[PDB]
Design a protein around this nucleic acid. Structure first.
Length: 84
DNA sequence: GCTAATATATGC
DNA sequence: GCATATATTAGC
């Protein structure tokens, strides 16, 4: 259900949109920066990923399927709250 | 499994 | 140097 390229997709998205891990972790799968940093460092194959990790990856995958304009609008608003 | 704190790294 | 972002990891 989760693509083996999810990690590559997240990295490309962060660079594309120019956003922090904090913002993406919050809007994409409702978690914090450190958790995403670790998730990205380990790059655990979805095929052997734990239930909690799959939940997180699936949420990310789903978010990425949203229109680019909508993802960007979502990031812009979260960044404002984050700055606060 | 995670969040929150914090040592380091970044971009201006 | 200031304001943020990322890597680590102690404490729930």
């Amino acid at each position: 259900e989760v693509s083996s390229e999810i990690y590559q997709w997240v990295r490309d998205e962060l660079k594309r949109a120019g956003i922090s891990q904090a913002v993406f972790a919050r809007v994409a799968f409702n978690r914090t920066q450190g958790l995403l940093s670790e998730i990205l460092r380990k790059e655990e194959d979805p095929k052997t990923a734990s239930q909690s990790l799959l939940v997180n990856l699936r949420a990310m995958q789903n978010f990425l399927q949203l229109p680019e304009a909508e993802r960007d609008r979502i990031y812009q608003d979260e960044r404002e709250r984050s700055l606060r």
